[PDB]
Motif scaffolding. Structure first.
Motif, PDB file in Angstrom:
ATOM      1  N   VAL A 204      -4.502  26.271   9.361  1.00 33.44           N
ATOM      2  CA  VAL A 204      -4.567  24.995   8.640  1.00 33.44           C
ATOM      3  C   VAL A 204      -3.396  24.904   7.673  1.00 33.44           C
ATOM      4  CG1 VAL A 204      -5.890  23.495   7.107  1.00 33.44           C
ATOM      5  CG2 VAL A 204      -7.064  24.849   8.883  1.00 33.44           C
ATOM      6  N   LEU A 205      -3.136  26.005   6.935  1.00 40.76           N
ATOM      7  CA  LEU A 205      -2.019  26.078   6.003  1.00 40.76           C
ATOM      8  C   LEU A 205      -0.698  25.879   6.720  1.00 40.76           C
ATOM      9  CD1 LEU A 205      -3.225  29.034   3.803  1.00 40.76           C
ATOM     10  CD2 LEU A 205      -2.886  26.613   3.068  1.00 40.76           C
ATOM     11  N   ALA A 206      -0.535  26.501   7.897  1.00 37.75           N
ATOM     12  CA  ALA A 206       0.676  26.368   8.690  1.00 37.75           C
ATOM     13  C   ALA A 206       0.883  24.893   9.092  1.00 37.75           C
ATOM     14  CB  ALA A 206       0.589  27.256   9.926  1.00 37.75           C
ATOM     15  N   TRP A 207      -0.200  24.224   9.488  1.00 42.32           N
ATOM     16  CA  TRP A 207      -0.154  22.815   9.866  1.00 42.32           C
ATOM     17  C   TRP A 207       0.129  21.884   8.648  1.00 42.32           C
ATOM     18  CZ3 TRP A 207      -4.201  19.419   8.489  1.00 42.32           C
ATOM     19  CH2 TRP A 207      -4.222  18.174   9.114  1.00 42.32           C
ATOM     20  N   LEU A 208      -0.293  22.283   7.446  1.00 42.74           N
ATOM     21  CA  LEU A 208      -0.006  21.552   6.211  1.00 42.74           C
ATOM     22  C   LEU A 208       1.515  21.672   5.906  1.00 42.74           C
ATOM     23  CD1 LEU A 208      -3.273  22.332   4.119  1.00 42.74           C
ATOM     24  CD2 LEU A 208      -2.562  20.157   5.167  1.00 42.74           C
ATOM     25  N   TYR A 209       2.119  22.850   6.175  1.00 47.32           N
ATOM     26  CA  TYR A 209       3.572  23.033   6.058  1.00 47.32           C
ATOM     27  C   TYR A 209       4.314  22.162   7.088  1.00 47.32           C
ATOM     28  CZ  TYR A 209       3.476  26.877   2.724  1.00 47.32           C
ATOM     29  OH  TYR A 209       3.343  27.627   1.584  1.00 47.32           O
TER      30      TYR A 209
END
Ligand SMILES: Cc1ccncc1N(C)C(=O)Cc1cccc(Cl)c1
Ligand SMILES: Cc1ccncc1N(C)C(=O)Cc1cccc(Cl)c1
Lengths: 304, 304
Positions: A204-209
């Motif tokens: 999820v964090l990677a997709w937020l980046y």
């Protein structure tokens, strides 16, 4: 510009797909070198799947009972063995289209492409993730067993999944290419319920980046947090606990955008607590967890 | 079980991808028979893109200025012509991997797969739709021009899109394989704004049928509506007007599920008016419009 749920090109895996028939059961096989890999339940009838004893059922099968068809030509089966839940059919011809390959067992959270096949023929390709409960949310019908999941690193195909089963809840279970099931599943027509499908937090964090990289920034807030504080919130919303290992893997994304990992965690914390308030991120109204930090880097850089 | 945004297998299109260089500009080309198709802006420098006069710029280019590389071997260019916004490079060798193919111009609402490429090499495959404003929401970086969009019907690849441009808003514009741009876009580094991106209503309905087929039924209500009443609501929410032609195309989905088209329209009407109230349909928190009724039928039946 743009961020899409992207699968790897499937040509190298299409050239490996064959049809395997044993008696009246037909499924897909993977032909690499002089070996055809397929689910062992190809030897079962519907009566057999209730409580199959595969060693006993294999005794009544000879090399000539396995019909392997590549395109429209028949492969000669010169040997057969059972390795865990897969059958290995030794054929007399090496696949001329065998690409560079490895067999890898992936961990939950890791993503891969699936080439869905029916009767040895490919129907489509999509991106999946191995869920934390060891199921995959695929798109498979009867006949799709033996379809494989894979990742590609330049010219090497790492095969990681072979489709075997549909659980009563519409989710899917399968093995690695050594025949070992992901999770606790068994190749038997018995009710097997899946565990909690928690959200892959590092993804999820990677997709937020990836969203910050492409212009969607509304969700960036003025807060920061700690790993222990973020994890209290993650536990409440059935998100996987975030470790320093996950923080390390997010490092290149943090470096490109200039947004610290813990700052992005505070943004994710507020998104969990407040919701998206009718808004979208990368065209999605929910937090996407099927892009790893590697997938974001590859897609955002153009790795071929 | 399961419903995924599925692309067609890309092998037949991977075998057609080449790298085209003209001067210091490198992009992708499509090699079908003895012809390489690529965007005409391959002859431009960054200075040229401001206000290019392609007929004038082509005068200074000879067959030997176009470098076509397939894998790592060089193709001999024996002719060149400009057809609308694409260049056709006659090579002295027919592509041995040329599949059965057609060139088709699709209408907005129609979906297709894109094989994103960089330097003649494929990086990934994803599913798109031609938006009602004639843009596509792809995932393309610099170097991806010449990547193509396509559909496959058994053994025939219908090429429908060639990537040319990124609009200032991060959305993408391109041509059919005759070089004709979809929409009003021109291959010039000039600000060109996109029109209203309305929702493809026939596709949302098709995806609601795919959801009913796979178990997501909470959204089915006790109401019905008429085409004129549904369209008043569709206008308010920037949805494409639904015609009897769309109703006809939804017929097989209506027949399989036993839910009349107009009844499913009333469910869609209530979903627009009330929202999803924190719920999901086929793992999405918004109404998906990039599956046509044909895509739902194919995916739900297993067409290879
Ligand atoms: C119907 C279907 C849909 C999607 N994917 C797979 C299936 N099939 C064929 C099965 O689950 C068969 C099966 C039943 C029980 C155990 C095992 Cl190992 C396999
Ligand atoms: C940067 C980028 C990202 C994604 N897709 C494409 C691009 N490129 C290369 C362009 O838009 C170039 C271009 C500029 C102006 C007109 C035209 Cl026809 C092409």
């Amino acid at each position: 510009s743009g961020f899409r749920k992207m699968a790897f090109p499937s040509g190298k895996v299409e050239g490996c797909m064959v049809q395997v028939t044993c008696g009246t059961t037909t499924l897909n096989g993977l032909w690499l070198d002089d070996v055809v890999y397929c689910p062992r339940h190809v030897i079962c009838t519907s009566e057999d799947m209730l409580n199959p004893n595969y060693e006993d059922l294999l005794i009544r099968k000879s090399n000539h009972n396995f019909l392997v068809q590549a395109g429209n030509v028949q492969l000669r089966v010169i040997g057969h063995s059972m390795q865990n839940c897969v059958l290995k059919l030794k054929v007399d011809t090496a696949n001329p289209k065998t690409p560079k390959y490895k067999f890898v067992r992936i961990q939950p959270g890791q993503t891969f492409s699936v080439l869905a096949c029916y009767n040895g023929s490919p129907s489509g390709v999509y991106q999946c993730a191995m869920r934390p409960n060891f199921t995959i949310k695929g798109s498979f019908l009867n006949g799709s067993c033996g379809s494989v999941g894979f990742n590609i690193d330049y010219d090497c195909v790492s095969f990681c999944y072979m489709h075997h089963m549909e659980l009563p809840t519409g989710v899917h279970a399968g093995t690695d290419l050594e025949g070992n099931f992901y999770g606790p599943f068994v190749d038997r027509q018995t009710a097997q319920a899946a565990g909690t499908d928690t959200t892959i937090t590092v993804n999820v964090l990677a997709w937020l980046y990836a969203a910050v990289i492409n212009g969607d920034r509304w969700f960036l807030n003025r807060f920061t947090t700690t790993l222990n504080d973020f994890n209290l919130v993650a536990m409440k919303y059935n998100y996987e606990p975030l470790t320093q290992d996950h923080v390390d893997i997010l490092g290149p994304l943090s470096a490109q955008t200039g947004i610290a990992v813990l700052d992005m965690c505070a943004s994710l914390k507020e998104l969990l607590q407040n919701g998206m308030n009718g808004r979208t991120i990368l065209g999605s109204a929910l937090l996407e967890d099927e892009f790893t930090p590697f997938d974001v880097v590859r897609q955002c850089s153009g790795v071929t």
